Amino acid sequence: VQLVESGGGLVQPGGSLRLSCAASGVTVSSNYMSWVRQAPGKGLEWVSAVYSGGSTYYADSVKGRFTISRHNSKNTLYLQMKSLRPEDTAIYYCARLINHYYDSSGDGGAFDIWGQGTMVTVSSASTKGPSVFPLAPGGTAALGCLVKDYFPEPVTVSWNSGALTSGVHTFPAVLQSSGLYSLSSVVTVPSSSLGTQTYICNVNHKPSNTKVDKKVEP
Amino acid sequence: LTQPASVSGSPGQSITISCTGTSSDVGSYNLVSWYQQRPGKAPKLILYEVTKRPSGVSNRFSGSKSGNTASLAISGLQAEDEADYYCCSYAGSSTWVFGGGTKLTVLGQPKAAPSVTLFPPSSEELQANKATLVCLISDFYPGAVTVAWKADSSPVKAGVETTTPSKQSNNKYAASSYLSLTPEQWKSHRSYSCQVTHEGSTVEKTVAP
Amino acid sequence: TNLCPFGEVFNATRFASVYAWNRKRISNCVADYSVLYNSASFSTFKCYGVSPTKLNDLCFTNVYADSFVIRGDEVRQIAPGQTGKIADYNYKLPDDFTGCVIAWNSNNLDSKVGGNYNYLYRLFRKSNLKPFERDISTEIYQAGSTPCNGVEGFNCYFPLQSYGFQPTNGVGYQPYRVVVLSFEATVCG
């Protein structure tokens, strides 16, 4: 039935974290297990496996820093991480690895039961509110707000206090080398209206108690 | 392991998705598996030992191996098969290696070129000794673009951040690219350009101080 | 003129693991199997050649006393014709077995709070033992088609498994000590 992960969070470079994978309806001590990780927007990467007799194996990018283990009394698998690097930021899945005795015909060698995943962010960034910049602007004009350098996600953007939603495209954020996020919102409005109607974007970043209004003018 | 980044098919068509490893990976063992992944969800096993299907996986999905290359074939392609697909292989000595992933699109509307809006740095941002170029990319289908920036004529890699594509409510895609810039760099060049290539044809926008 | 030292095997302080079962040769003595039978309340003492009282009449060239520890629910496998991890990978009797199988619960001695892991049994083997064969090798067992390269890993198992004798174990998982008497003339009743 189920593998329920926990323990993920935010940690600074060189910090430590212990992930847990609590099993239900399968016995961890009777199974090959693995940890597989997925950086945001990237592919799956195998990280670690435990087999019989306590034998354990690891990806090169992880040797000496991570340790897989289990507690039979809790029916739980663990991943203990140390010396965390920014490139260790990922969703971490635990999975069951079937083997020869799964059907006693073939070798198995695949991950059939997967945890939900738990997010691990390795960053030295601090909670920080965004700087908001207007992006001033045929039949239609595009105008915008740049919501720059905030941490962490998310941020709320609205236009004219929520009354302007038609033609609004708010874009998912990007992450910079600095560790901070930026995103933008644009509204397409009739360009005949640019002299008569006003346009204000409203930015709310709750982690930093930051609320900003910015008038967007030609 | 090496997979195509993208694969396209119309409903009812048949596709194939390849996965190339080495004599050490796909070539040495019959332990290839495949996984389907939907946004925000965990991977789901659909093939293992090269060709076998878990209970509950439709036999529209089938797998094979030849030399160092495994293949995943999907017939009677349905809308629900739009997802990411990953191959995996035993890599010797109790280790495992995944392919980079392939994004399968089930074509459900005609191809569409990206719509591009480029904003230069605002006055207020410049007055704070910073500058950002903002390239917003809308209405493209399927959802794969590459973005290249040019200061005047020369390519820029440093200071560029581009988002993954994201599905709009009309099932086309949007993306963002940012160029972080010095105020002097912004004032000094005659122009900057963000070039969005979609399906081998490029849309460009250009701004100037 | 003197008795056989059956207490040297039965009342021994430590017992072998089953995969490395002890054999003690017994010879040049007089053996009364009726006092051995009534020496304790054994949970098992079953003879396959002839009975205890019958044995006090015979003479044998040699008697052998094999001894070891297993868990309760495996005591049924110490019998001719049986199958299972124990009868096939650890200790096997000839089908044509003339002797006695003697066992008793050992929970007070051989279990430990938090577990005794000193007692082992062979879980994996590529083929069955022969009757009275002993295998104490410790090669990595290759369960699948990929090489083990001499270490534990994917489908590659250390072949011995430990019992975890805890005093609170269910009776099928409690330790039992076993003595098997073989009768192949130095030993008489």
Side-chain angles (χ1 to χ4, degrees), chain B residues 128-141:
Chain B
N129 212 30
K130 268 159 198 291
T132 310
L133 299 171
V134 182
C135 184
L136 308 161
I137 313 165
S138 290
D139 293 337
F140 52 97
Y141 187 88

Side-chain angles (χ1 to χ4, degrees), chain B residues 66-111:
Chain B
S66 193
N68 290 344
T69 291
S71 294
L72 159 66
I74 310 175
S75 82
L77 196 61
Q78 303 185 1
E80 302 68 359
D81 311 326
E82 181 163 313
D84 283 307
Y85 293 85
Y86 291 92
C87 65
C88 179
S89 176
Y90 195 57
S93 309
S94 304
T95 71
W96 304 86
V97 58
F98 285 95
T102 301
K103 168 57 176 284
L104 165 57
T105 301
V106 175
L107 285 305
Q109 62 174 120
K111 313 285 212 61

Side-chain angles (χ1 to χ4, degrees), chain A residues 34-210:
Chain A
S34 276
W35 289 92
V36 176
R37 83 181 167 182
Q38 191 167 36
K42 296 300 189 141
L44 301 166
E45 185 195 0
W46 173 78
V47 163
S48 187
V50 60
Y51 304 94
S52 60
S55 58
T56 65
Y57 293 78
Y58 302 92
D60 284 329
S61 62
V62 152
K63 287 180 183 188
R65 297 185 300 112
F66 300 185
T67 74
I68 192 179
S69 66
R70 68 193 203 213
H71 270 156
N72 303 327
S73 49
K74 298 179 184 293
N75 195 23
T76 292
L77 186 83
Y78 297 96
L79 186 62
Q80 173 66 59
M81 313 202 269
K82 293 184 182 174
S83 315
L84 283 154
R85 306 163 182 167
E87 62 265 43
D88 298 314
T89 296
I91 282 178
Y92 280 71
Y93 302 105
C94 63
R96 195 272 292 277
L97 171 54
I98 56 178
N99 57 28
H100 181 260
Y101 292 101
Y102 183 70
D103 69 26
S104 297
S105 167
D107 286 342
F111 311 101
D112 64 333
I113 307 170
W114 286 78
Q116 51 168 350
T118 185
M119 183 74 209
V120 170
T121 309
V122 187
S123 165
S124 57
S126 310
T127 293
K128 173 167 195 277
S131 300
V132 183
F133 298 106
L135 312 172
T140 64
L143 53 85
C145 274
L146 173 57
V147 186
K148 195 191 172 45
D149 287 350
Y150 60 95
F151 185 91
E153 308 209 71
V155 74
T156 287
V157 186
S158 72
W159 289 84
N160 287 352
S161 305
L164 183 57
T165 62
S166 194
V168 169
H169 201 296
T170 298
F171 289 71
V174 76
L175 175 55
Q176 282 154 96
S177 288
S178 73
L180 304 173
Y181 294 91
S182 307
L183 62 74
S184 310
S185 187
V186 286
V187 193
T188 299
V189 304
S191 59
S192 82
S193 76
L194 284 168
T196 181
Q197 163 76 296
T198 63
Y199 297 106
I200 299 151
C201 82
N202 321 108
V203 182
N204 196 1
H205 182 236
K206 279 146 173 181
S208 73
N209 311 306
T210 292

Side-chain angles (χ1 to χ4, degrees), chain C residues 6-182:
Chain C
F6 279 138
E8 273 174 18
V9 308
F10 277 87
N11 286 322
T13 313
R14 316 188 317 272
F15 264 51
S17 282
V18 71
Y19 87 96
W21 45 276
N22 274 110
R23 175 154 280 190
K24 175 177 207 83
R25 173 193 37 91
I26 278 173
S27 51
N28 301 334
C29 55
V30 189
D32 182 39
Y33 303 105
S34 294
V35 183
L36 186 48
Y37 186 87
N38 306 285
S39 162
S41 293
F42 300 107
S43 49
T44 296
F45 168 37
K46 166 73 164 103
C47 301
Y48 295 81
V50 288
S51 74
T53 59
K54 268 62 192 168
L55 278 171
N56 282 339
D57 198 43
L58 291 311
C59 290
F60 295 108
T61 177
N62 260 329
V63 175
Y64 295 101
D66 305 328
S67 57
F68 52 78
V69 160
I70 50 167
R71 58 167 64 156
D73 65 14
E74 289 162 341
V75 163
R76 63 184 281 281
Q77 290 180 47
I78 313 303
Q82 288 295 307
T83 50
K85 309 314 207 316
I86 301 312
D88 289 332
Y89 294 171
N90 287 266
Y91 184 86
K92 184 173 276 310
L93 288 180
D95 287 328
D96 314 319
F97 172 58
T98 286
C100 304
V101 176
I102 316 178
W104 66 97
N105 183 301
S106 167
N107 191 41
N108 45 358
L109 309 184
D110 283 321
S111 66
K112 178 193 321 165
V113 186
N116 178 2
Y117 297 85
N118 291 345
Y119 287 110
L120 303 177
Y121 67 98
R122 180 171 311 273
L123 177 50
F124 302 100
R125 204 178 195 272
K126 289 179 287 174
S127 81
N128 287 352
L129 300 177
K130 288 151 199 82
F132 291 134
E133 192 178 0
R134 184 198 293 108
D135 176 355
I136 66 170
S137 69
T138 49
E139 286 181 354
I140 298 303
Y141 174 86
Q142 193 192 313
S145 71
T146 55
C148 301
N149 303 130
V151 291
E152 287 189 280
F154 178 58
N155 291 334
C156 290
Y157 298 79
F158 194 64
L160 316 181
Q161 182 62 274
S162 88
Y163 306 105
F165 293 130
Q166 300 177 96
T168 61
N169 275 353
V171 67
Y173 293 77
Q174 288 180 11
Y176 276 71
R177 285 165 175 211
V178 183
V179 169
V180 188
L181 298 179
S182 278

